[PDB]
UniProtKB/Swiss-Prot annotation:
Post-translational modification: Phosphorylation by CK2 disrupt the intramolecular binding between the bromo domain 2 and the NPS region and promotes binding between the NPS and the BID regions, leading to activate the protein and promote binding to acetylated histones. In absence of phosphorylation, BRD4 does not localize to p53/TP53 target gene promoters, phosphorylation promoting recruitment to p53/TP53 target promoters.
Effect of residue 98 to A: Abolishes binding to acetylated histones
Gene name for this UniProt entry: BRD4
Protein purpose: Chromatin reader protein that recognizes and binds acetylated histones and plays a key role in transmission of epigenetic memory across cell divisions and transcription regulation. Remains associated with acetylated chromatin throughout the entire cell cycle and provides epigenetic memory for postmitotic G1 gene transcription by preserving acetylated chromatin status and maintaining high-order chromatin structure. During interphase, plays a key role in regulating the transcription of signal-inducible genes by associating with the P-TEFb complex and recruiting it to promoters.
Name of the protein described by the UniProt record: Bromodomain-containing protein 4
Amino acid sequence: MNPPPPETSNPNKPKRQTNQLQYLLRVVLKTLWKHQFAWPFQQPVDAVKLNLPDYYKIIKTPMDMGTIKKRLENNYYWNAQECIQDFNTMFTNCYIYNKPGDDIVLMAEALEKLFLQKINELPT
Ligand SMILES: Cc1ccc([C@H](C)Nc2ccc3c(c2)N(C2CC2)[C@@H](C)C(=O)N3C)cc1
């Protein structure tokens, strides 16, 4: 039931170390990582273990903070916007599969509120 996880290295792809990308790893991701609600989002959804055989029938572009962390550590991104997009894909997937008011949604919303606070100002 589990698909292969998103790639965390791609050589066909050009890489960049920007000040914003370093900050997204050192400050943004690491703060979110320690949040009390971060743990469901620290690795790909394990649909077999959660016995959610429908998850990957619905979610076709999965994303999680473990994948983002590995991408950042591998300089996988060209710019901060690409990384921010991965965060937003992660949150949106949770809002798509689940319903407003669900506990997992409350957790994603708390992480998203903090994410938006931390990315409001990025380095130059
Ligand atoms: C409040 C509560 C209940 C269960 C769990 C289980 C143990 N782990 C887990 C990790 C990530 C996800 C989910 C479950 N959900 C399930 C709907 C619960 C899927 C759909 C989803 O979208 N994500 C992001 C954690 C937190």
